[PDB]
Amino acid sequence: MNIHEWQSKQLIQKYGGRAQSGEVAFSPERSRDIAKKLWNQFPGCKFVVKAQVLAGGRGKGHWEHGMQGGVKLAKTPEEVYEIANEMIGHKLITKQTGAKGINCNKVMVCGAVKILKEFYLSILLDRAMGCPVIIATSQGGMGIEEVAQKCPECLFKVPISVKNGPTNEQLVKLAKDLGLEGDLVQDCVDNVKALYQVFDKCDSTMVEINPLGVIETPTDEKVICCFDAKIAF
Amino acid sequence: IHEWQSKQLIQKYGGRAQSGEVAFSPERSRDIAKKLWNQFPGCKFVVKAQVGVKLAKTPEEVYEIANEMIGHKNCNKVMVCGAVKILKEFYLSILLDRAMGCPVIIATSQGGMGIEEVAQKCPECLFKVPISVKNGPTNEQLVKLAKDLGLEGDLVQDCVDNVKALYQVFDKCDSTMVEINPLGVIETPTDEKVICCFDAKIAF
Numbered sequence: 001m002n003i004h005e006w007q008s009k010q011l012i013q014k015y016g017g018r019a020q021s022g023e024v025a026f027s028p029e030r031s032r033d034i035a036k037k038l039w040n041q042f043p044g045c046k047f048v049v050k051a052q053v054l055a056g057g058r059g060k061g062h063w064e065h066g067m068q069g070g071v072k073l074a075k076t077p078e079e080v081y082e083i084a085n086e087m088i089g090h091k092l093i094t095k096q097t098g099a100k101g102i103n104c105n106k107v108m109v110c111g112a113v114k115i116l117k118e119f120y121l122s123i124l125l126d127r128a129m130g131c132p133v134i135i136a137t138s139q140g141g142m143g144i145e146e147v148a149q150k151c152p153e154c155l156f157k158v159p160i161s162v163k164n165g166p167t168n169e170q171l172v173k174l175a176k177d178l179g180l181e182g183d184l185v186q187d188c189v190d191n192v193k194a195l196y197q198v199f200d201k202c203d204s205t206m207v208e209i210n211p212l213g214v215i216e217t218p219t220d221e222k223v224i225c226c227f228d229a230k231i232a233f
Numbered sequence: 234i235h236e237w238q239s240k241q242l243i244q245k246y247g248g249r250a251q252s253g254e255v256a257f258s259p260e261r262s263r264d265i266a267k268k269l270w271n272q273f274p275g276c277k278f279v280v281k282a283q284v285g286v287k288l289a290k291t292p293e294e295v296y297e298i299a300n301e302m303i304g305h306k307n308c309n310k311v312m313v314c315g316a317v318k319i320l321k322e323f324y325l326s327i328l329l330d331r332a333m334g335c336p337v338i339i340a341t342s343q344g345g346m347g348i349e350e351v352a353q354k355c356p357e358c359l360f361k362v363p364i365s366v367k368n369g370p371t372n373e374q375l376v377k378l379a380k381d382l383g384l385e386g387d388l389v390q391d392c393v394d395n396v397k398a399l400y401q402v403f404d405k406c407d408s409t410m411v412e413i414n415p416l417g418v419i420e421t422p423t424d425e426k427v428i429c430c431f432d433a434k435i436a437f
């Protein structure tokens with residue numbers, strides 16, 4: 001992750017968005033310290049250890065030395081050490097790789113959150129159109145590439161005005177089209193607005209959020225939260 | 234011992250405690266809350282003035298509260314804690330009872346209140362448990378104390394674990410009092426129910 005991209009993820013929170021970025025660790029020891037420090041704030045919480053490799057289906061793939069999964073739930077900081085040790089410096093295999101192997105040199109240590117709904121949402125520069133387009137689906141867990149090829153009308157597509165950007169009516173209906181009601185409608189609007197602010201302020205070619213989730217905070221407020229945000233140029 | 238050193242000892246010996254993180258300025262208080270939103274977005278915060286306790290919704294509220302604490306009636310640091318869902322507050326201590334000549338465990342379902350006041354007006358609801366310093370506390374004693382506090386399920390064993398860890402701090406530090414007020418039954422962010430020490434006091 002170069003400075004250009006990392007400075008963009010930061011803008012998500014600046015422009016009103018809500019996102020979990022976790023924290024990067026380049027060693028299993030550091031992975032353990034992260035989880036340990038987090039237990040000082042939310043004792044007894046669980047953790048999610050995510051292998052940081054540029055490849056999809058991490059949660060599906062497997063490791064060369066017996067372990068299963070690129071996204072793993074951990075109960076303690078020691079389990080975080082164990083998992084991270086099997087990831088950092090080893091090859092991960094997914095559909096993207098068949099069996100070529102993809103070497104992992106770092107992990108994300110994330111607090112385990114309660115996820116109520118999962119969505120996919122991206123903002124792309126459509127060259128054939130010469131404008132931005134918001135693409136979203138409520139299948140949530142199935143990933144975009146699968147849904148697009150195998151389901152025609154599952155996707156919500158919204159062309160965006162270059163001068164005006166998205167409109168509240170556009171974003172409100174989209175929030176509604178994703179099954180959101182109550183306060184979560186406006187919360188989603190604010191987050192997508194933030195995502196587009198980033199998309200345009202950074203001359204980005206794609207802003208991908210997978211999952212865009214309805215979560216519960218430790219004190220059980222229901223809020224929109226961006227996971228595993230990705231930006232391209 | 235100070236509160237931050239006490240909670241450190243409790244975790245070493247197998248206890249669960251919320252330590253928060255210390256800030257010596259309102260600015261640093263805001264940064265702590267900010268970084269915490271990277272792990273549990275949308276969470277709330279508790280701000281405790283240190284040598285009084287307020288709930289904050291944003292890192293900016295955390296700044297405002299810390300600004301009214303640090304440098305005022307004199308407080309010069311704050312602990313910034315993630316706001317945790319709390320189901321029950323208990324009191325628990327381990328005291329060297331001189332009259333009986335042995336350690337004693339004192340516990341109440343009346344967490345948040347001073348033990349002097351609770352015993353004065355509700356002597357009925359204090360659980361005393363003398364400890365044989367040779368064999369220390371037995372797991373049999375601790376299971377009853379847990380049941381007598383209205384605990385069932387995994388919380389009963391979780392309570393034994395934490396109380397055992399507290400006795401170790403008492404025994405190993407040769408302390409005259411280890412006091413947890415409140416000792417809470419909380420819910421983790423994924424709704425697991427566990428025991429947690431929120432405050433600790435160790436006397437010598």
Ligand SMILES: Nc1ncnc2c1ncn2[C@@H]1O[C@H](COP(=O)(O)OP(=O)(O)O)[C@@H](O)[C@H]1O
Pocket residue numbers: 020048055056057058059060071110111112113114115118141143210211227228
């Ligand atoms: N911080 C977290 N807390 C709880 N569950 C999480 C967290 N991060 C991810 N998950 C869950 O684990 C899944 C991991 O999948 P994801 O990271 O989206 O990509 P992949 O499909 O490649 O595994 C998420 O879809 C979500 O259901």
Ligand SMILES: [Mg+2]
Pocket residue numbers: 216217218219220318420422423424
């Ligand atoms: Mg909850």
